Amino acid sequence: LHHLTRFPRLEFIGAPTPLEYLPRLSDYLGREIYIKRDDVTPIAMGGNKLRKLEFLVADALREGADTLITAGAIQSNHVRQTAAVAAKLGLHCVALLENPIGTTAENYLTNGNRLLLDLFNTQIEMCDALTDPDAQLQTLATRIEAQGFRPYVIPVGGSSALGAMGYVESALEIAQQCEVGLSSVVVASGSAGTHAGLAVGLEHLMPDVELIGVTVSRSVAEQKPKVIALQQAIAGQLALTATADIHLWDDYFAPGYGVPNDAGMEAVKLLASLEGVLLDPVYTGKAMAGLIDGISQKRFNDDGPILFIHTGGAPALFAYHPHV
Amino acid sequence: MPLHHLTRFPRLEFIGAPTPLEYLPRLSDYLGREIYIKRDDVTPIAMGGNKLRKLEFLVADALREGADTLITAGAIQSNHVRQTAAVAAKLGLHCVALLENPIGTTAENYLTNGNRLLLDLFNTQIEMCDALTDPDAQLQTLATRIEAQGFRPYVIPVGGSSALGAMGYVESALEIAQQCEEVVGLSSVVVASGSAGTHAGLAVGLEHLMPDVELIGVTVSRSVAEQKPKVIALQQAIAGQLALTATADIHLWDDYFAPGYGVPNDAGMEAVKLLASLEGVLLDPVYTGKAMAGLIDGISQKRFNDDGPILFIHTGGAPALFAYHPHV
């Protein structure tokens, strides 16, 4: 795994993020539950996207870029973290945003992550839909370049093979921190970089552990090709083999990306009330709902300890309140 | 060596490792002065903040007493209440909160979003009152009612600001001294001064570890005349508990909080926008935005002892941004 040091990398996090036992949640579910606190990173309310940006933005600087361009929903955590990093480094930031849920709710449209974008002086470009994100970002990049800037394009969710190296890094922390008998790891699976990064790292570091991605936007059939593709791409770049099966549960995100559901919201309440831990309605709440039902349906490989990867997202709580 | 009596006070571990102390190169470039930041806003519990350091001592005391319930008070958008509630949930303690609306707003996000929203997630029992006219007395009346239900209550004062709670910031000063060692020779430290525990704890710690550093408290709710005896009372009580003397004068600037506690002002807003746009750092309209506006003006007016490096204590507060939006 030494090839990770060959990639340029900025230091946004520093020390490994905490890995904690959750004794009250464990007592309630009758199962040992641990949490990787990737929500606690120091930049602009934190999250998983920061691990990716350590690599992506290092690349951006290597190319001498002065502008970061990315895309996501109005309430995207990735756009928020990209914009914070841009501000920190004196780079301009252009965000291509969509309204994925057709809401006119004031807090969704203007509060939460979207509010922070304004504080970070993000240039906002609206679009009807992100039907072809890569191509749409490329078009915007040319226009911004025509204005006299030197743009660097960061893909949706920061999920490229390079971005996903942040989660190979996270896997190293996990492996060091777990040295008890961990059986399963649960993570939200969205743009797939987090899932795929963890997949490559955990195959080599903790081969006996089962990694489960809980989809937040797509069926198993649509999502599996995406995760596998990144997995193979990451593996090649690190000069590793990656043969582990990708596991995905798609039962926990209906009626679609960015729409809260009851199981998800109840998971948010459960973690807040038992552990003082804040999840979110779009990602971690749905992923935790998956973990809980996995216990209910005896869906994991065995009865042993489960590690939940907290990827962040809590600023969305304030955007989604009171509804829509 | 000098702060060794801190050992005798029981404490829970909520923070873990020392919080980051960071240079702010873009802010420093703009202000023409070396600016560092102590990131007490980045702690692991429910969006972080200064109040957590106090809770390490207060809640340890509660557990030693056999208490199963935490009672405290503050504004609807109190960070202290939010952090207290989060710790209570984590430890399986009941939490009861006496809340007031200090600004008389009817704005829906102030009333129900931000910190207030999180209170419901932590299952806090919420008690409204017209105003916290006598917080200590009102807390005791509530404690009596709660005790009558069979609960074993532990009353935490507004802001967590008792001599015991303030030990959290004596501890913070130890981190600061260690982090600055052979790295930076600080001239000044700036912190928001509210219920006064943070200011007072830092005052005691810094007098002993870094006596030549100038500690500036920027008031968020009171004039220098009203605030200073509160800080001094705590400073002296903290020193006593540690078998130390504290002879340092307390310094406060009160020019930066008008028109009052919990009301945003223009300079505060501009300080929030400055830190966000230059450093990707999130301040808040009630506390840190106002303290930072003080730091900035202090530089502009040459209010500090000299032209040397300034450390800003980031005490947190950012969830209030979502409560104050779009207006109050």
Residue numbers in the entry:
A (entry chain B): 3 to 181, 184 to 328
B (entry chain A): 1 to 328
What wording appears in the published article?
D-Ser, although analogous to D-Cys, is a poor substrate. Hence, the structures of StDCyD cocrystallized with D- and L-Ser were determined. In these structures, electron density was observed near the active site into which the respective ligand could be fitted. However, the internal aldimine was not disrupted. Presence of non-covalently attached D- and L-Ser at the active site of the structures of these complexes suggests that the formation of external aldimine might be the slowest step in the catalytic reaction for these two substrates. Comparison of these two liganded forms reveals that the enantiomers are oriented with their Cα protons pointing in nearly opposite directions. The proton at the Cα of D-Ser is oriented towards the hydroxyl of Tyr287. Therefore, it is reasonable to suggest that the catalytic reaction with D-Ser is initiated by the abstraction of the Cα proton by Tyr287. This is consistent with the observation that Y287F is completely inactive. D- and L-Ser bind non-covalently at the active of StDCyD without forming external aldimines.
